[PDB]
Structure 1
C-alpha cells in the first residue's frame, strides 16, 4: 500500500531529530527526497544530521535549534520552518525531556517539566502548524509509548505526559472528523527501541529485546503517510496483539453513531 515516492518533495518537520528515532526519521525522509526541517537543542549535532540528509538525497534540509520548554520558541519555530519550505505537509512531534528510571518521591519539578516539554509543547506546535496543514490536507504524527497506554513503575511523570497526549490528540481527532478538518492524526505506541539513551537508561534493570530504531522510524513514517490512527511497534508479537483496545473503539463508536451532527448522511 505504501510507496516511498509518497514522501517525494513533501514538506516535513521532525522534532527531537538530533539523535534516536528522530535522527532516523530525518534520514529515511531524506532518502525519499523530502524537504525536512529538523530541531533539537544541540546546533552542533543538528548540523551533522542536516549534512547526511543532503547527502542521502533530501529535496532540501535545514535546522533550527532551541528548547521546547520555551513555548514562544515552539510557535516561532513552526513559522520559521514553514517559511523555509514554503509550506508544511507533515508534523512529526517526537522530542521529550530527558528522563531516567526512578521511583517517584517528591519531584514536582520533574512532573511539571515533563508535562511542559512532552505534552504542552506538542499542542503549541500543533496550533502553530494547523493553518499550513489545513491548506495541504496534511498530517500530524505524535510519538508515544506502551507506557502511554498501560501502567509501569519507574516512569510516573513520563507516563502521565504520554497518557495526556492520547486523551488530547484522540479527542481533537473526533473533532476534526465532525467539523471536516482534513488533517490526519497518528498516535505511535512503541516498546523499547534500541536508541542510545534508552539503552543507557535501561542497562541497570530488565532489558528485554529492544526493537531496531531504523525499522521503527520507517513504520512511524508509513503510519503518517497512510493516515492510520495508531501505529504499534514492539519486538514481541504478544505485546503487539495486547495493545489494541477493541472495547474502547466500540464505546467511542456507539457515541459517534448516536450524536455526531452527521449521524445519518454519507
Structure 2
C-alpha cells in the first residue's frame, strides 16, 4: 500500500499512547499524510515533544491531552470530548494504541491487582474514552475507530494472562461497535501490530533480538489504510500488520 501524500488531508484523528512507540509513529505518519492529529497520553512533557516534532515538520502544533487511562473517570473522558468539540467540528478517526501489558507468567501466579489494572486500561477506560467520542466520530463523512489487538486476542496462549484476556475483550467490544454502526458512516476495526520493535515487546521477550524485528515505521501501511477512504467498506474486522 502506497497512497498519495494527501490521503488524510484535513482529517482530524485522535491518537492515544502517542508518547512513544507505535502511537508516536502513527501520530507522525498521519501528520505527514495531511492529518490534523490530536495526541493523547500520560506524560505532558513527552507529548509536548511529539507535538513539537510534528510542528517542526508541518508548521502547526498539534493539540494534546494528558489522560491516565488507569485512573480516569467517565467524566474525565467526557472533558476530553468537550475540549475536542470546542476546537474541532468532528473526529475523522480514533486510534487506540494505549495498553498495559501487566504480568507475563502462569495463571497460578498472576497478581490480582495487576490483572485488574490491565482490564481497567485495555478494556474499561478504552471503552469509556470511546463512548465519549462517538458523537464527534459520527460527524465525520467516513469516521474510522481502530483498536489495538494481539495474536493472543485471537488464540489464547500460556503466560499471557490479563493481556490475552483483555485483547479477547477488545475484539468483542470492537465487534459490538462495528455491528451497531454497520450501515452508518462509522467503521470500526482492530489492528494486531505483530512482533514490533517496542519496549512492550522487549519486556515480554527479553532474549529476543529486537533488531531482527520490523520497526513501527515498517508497519505503517496498514495504519494509514484504515484511516483513509480505501478501507471505507471494511468494518468489524481484525487485521494483521505482519501476516
Partner of 1:233: 241
User: Which moved further from structure 2: 195-204 or 168-177?
Assistant: 195-204
Partner of 1:140: 145
CA distance 1:86–1:134, change in 2 (3 Å): closer
1:28 aligns with 2:29: yes
SS in 1 for 2:91: coil
Partner of 1:116: 120
8 Å contact from structure 1 (residues 95, 118) kept in 2: yes
1:127 aligns with 2:153: no
- TM-score when normalising by structure 1: 0.80
Larger radius of gyration: 1
Partner of 2:194: 191
- TM-score when normalising by structure 2: 0.86
| Root-mean-square deviation (Å) | 2.2
1:161 aligns with 2:169: no
Higher relative contact order (CA 8 A, sep 6+): 2
8 Å contact from structure 1 (residues 141, 185) kept in 2: yes
The total of aligned residue pairs comes to 233
8 Å contact from structure 1 (residues 35, 60) kept in 2: no
Partner of 1:40: 41
CA distance in 2, matches of 1:164, 1:158: 10
The partner residue of 1:102 within 88, 96, 105 is 105
Which string of whole-angstrom CA distances, capped at 9 and with x for unpartnered residues, describes residues 107-132 of structure 1?
A: 22122111111011222122111111
CA distance in 1, matches of 2:61, 2:24: 15
CA distance in 1, matches of 2:84, 2:240: 29
Runs of 5+ consecutive residues of structure 2 not aligned to the other structure: none
Displacement of 1:5: 1.5
Runs of 5+ consecutive residues of structure 1 not aligned to the other structure: 235-239, 241-266
CA distance 1:86–1:59, change in 2 (3 Å): farther
Partner of 1:68: 69
User: Which moved further from structure 2: 92-101 or 7-16?
Assistant: 92-101
SS in 2 for 1:118: helix
Partner of 2:53: 52
CA distance in 2, matches of 1:156, 1:163: 11
CA distance in 1, matches of 2:90, 2:180: 24
8 Å contact from structure 2 (residues 18, 40) kept in 1: yes
Partner of 2:156: 151
SS in 1 for 2:239: strand
Which string of whole-angstrom CA distances, capped at 9 and with x for unpartnered residues, describes residues 10-57 of structure 1?
A: 101000000110000000011122111101111111110000111222
The partner residue of 1:214 within 202, 217, 238 is 217
Displacement of 1:185: 0.6
CA distance in 2, matches of 1:24, 1:183: 24
